[PDB]
């Protein structure tokens, strides 16, 4: 079983620890953990292409999209590999993450190790926001916190 | 040419940017960049097994040594995959890095993507320190700064 971890850090109070586990190479990836310092509501939760944090979360580049598809929700057929949808934060700003995804992987072509996980300012509209930006980034806004996905024990 | 990058950060003033470039899968990895906030002299420069920063640089675990060899200098036959020797800091605390290594890789069994690059407190004795610890870590001491090795543009 291959395991990975991501420590989310940003310029504000947004911080968190996200774990990934894939017991079979052709099976789903379990993604769990907790993020604090968020505003109440939904926040875009995406895997971005580069594990580059030289100039903050912006250097992570665009969404991880090796198949060059339109942006969508995680349950959609038309989605980027990095399209993990939204995380929901409670009144105290704590988002309890528990996601199972079959598009992302911890090995091969759709491998997310060495890439950046980003928690966004606003909700990801899941490609149904009614504008050009919605079909690319889902109008999720600024990058609150990010971290490079690394190999875990 | 596959590219990787690492942003070094710690609890102290040590901060740096390190680049990795491997033009051919079997070819050598060109590692270059700069590290500041360092005491003048030599500092251990090692790739550690885990890309885990949950408890700072300690969670990165031991040296990346998949072939279970003794610690040595980068020019030695007997060395860990992660044994990148020493970086040299000037009187102003700046360490200019320009290393070429044929043991580390950005693919295959020796892939360092998603692992942690660490700059240490003291000089790496390169296994020639004369004690049991020398053949394990090179007596490089504390972990000043670390970062997960991520995929770059």
* DSSP per position, B52-104: --EEEEGGG-SB--TT-PPP--TTSSS--TTEEEEEEE-TTS-EEEEEEESS-
Alpha-carbon gap, residue B92 to A94, rounded angstroms: 43
Q: Residues B69, A22: contact at Cβ < 8 Å?
A: no
B82 vs B66: CA distance, rounded Å: 9
Q: Contact, A117 vs A47, CB < 8 A?
A: yes
Backbone torsion region of residue B139, taken as left when φ is above 0, otherwise alpha when ψ lies between -120 and 50, otherwise beta: left
Closest Cβ opposite residue A54 in set B17, B51, B52? B17
Give the whole-angstrom CA distance, residue B109 versus residue B121: 29
Sign for the pseudo-dihedral over CA of A4, A9, A124, A99 = positive
Between CA A116 and CA A48 the distance in angstroms is 5
Report the residue from A49, A61, A150 with minimal CB separation from B116.
A150
Alpha carbon dihedral B120, B126, B128, B132, in 10-degree steps, equals 60
Pick the residue from chain A with its C-alpha nearest to B49: A151
Pairing mode, strands B95-101 and B41-48: unpaired
CB count within 10 Å of CB A68 equals 6
Count the neighbouring beta carbons within 10 Å of the beta carbon of residue A136: 15
Query: Between A and B, how many CB-CB pairs are < 8 A?
Result: 82
Q: Which residues pair with A41 in a beta bridge?
A: A89
Bridge partner list, B21: B3, B30
Cβ neighbours around B1 below 10 Å, total: 9
A143 is catalytic: yes
DSSP secondary structure code for residue A88 in this structure: E
Record the tokens describing residue A19, joined without a space.
Answer: 């774990």
Instruction: Write out the H or E segment, with its range, that includes residue A79.
Output: none
For an interface test with A, the pick among B20, B57, B151 (most A C-beta atoms closer than 10 Å) comes out as B151
Q: From CA A7, how far away is CA B34, in angstroms rounded? A: 24
Provide, as residue numbers in chain A, all residues whose Cβ is less than 8 Å from the Cβ of B51. 4-5, 113-114, 148-152
CA distances from A144 to A16, A37, A73 (A): 11, 9, 20
Q: Residue A43 catalytic?
A: no
Block residue for tokens 């610690």:
B71
Which residues, in sequence order, are bridge partners of residue A9? A15, A146
Question: Can you give the resolution of this entry in Å?
Answer: 1.9
Q: In chain A, which residues have their Cβ closer than 8 Å to the Cβ of B113?
A: 51, 113-114
Closest Cα to residue A70, out of A2, A136, A139, A133? Answer: A136
Q: Annotated binding residue at A71?
A: yes
Chain B interface, best mutation among A15, A51, A149, by max B CB count within 10 A: A51
CA distances (Å), A30 to each of A64, A74, A95, B60, in order?
Answer: 18, 13, 16, 22
Give the count of beta carbons closer than 10 Å to the beta carbon of residue B108. 8
- CA end-to-end span of chain A, whole Å? 10
* Cα(A124)–Cα(A134) distance, integer angstroms: 8
Residue A110 known to be catalytic: no
Interface of B with A (CB under 8 A): 4-5, 7, 17, 49-54, 61, 113-116, 147-153
Active site residue A48: yes
Q: And the tokens for A135?
A: 């079909």
Decide: B51 and A149 in contact? Cβ < 8 Å. Answer: yes
Q: How far apart are CA A34 and CA B75, in angstroms?
A: 43
């Amino acid at each position: 079983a291959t395991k990975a971890v991501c420590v989310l850090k940003g310029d504000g109070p947004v911080q968190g620890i996200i774990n990934f586990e894939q017991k079979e190479s052709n099976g789903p990836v379990k993604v769990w953990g907790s993020i604090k310092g968020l505003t109440e509501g939904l926040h875009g939760f995406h895997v971005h292409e580069f594990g580059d944090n030289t100039a903050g979360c912006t250097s992570a580049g665009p969404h991880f999209n090796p198949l060059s598809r339109k942006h969508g929700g995680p349950k959609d057929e038309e989605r980027h590999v990095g399209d993990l949808g939204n995380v929901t934060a409670d009144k105290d700003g704590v988002a309890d993450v528990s996601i199972e995804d079959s598009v992302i992987s911890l090995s091969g072509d759709h491998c997310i190790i060495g890439r950046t996980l980003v928690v966004h300012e606003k909700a990801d509209d899941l490609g149904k926001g009614g504008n050009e930006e919605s079909t690319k980034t889902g109008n999720a806004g600024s990058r609150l916190a990010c971290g490079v996905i690394g190999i875990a024990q």
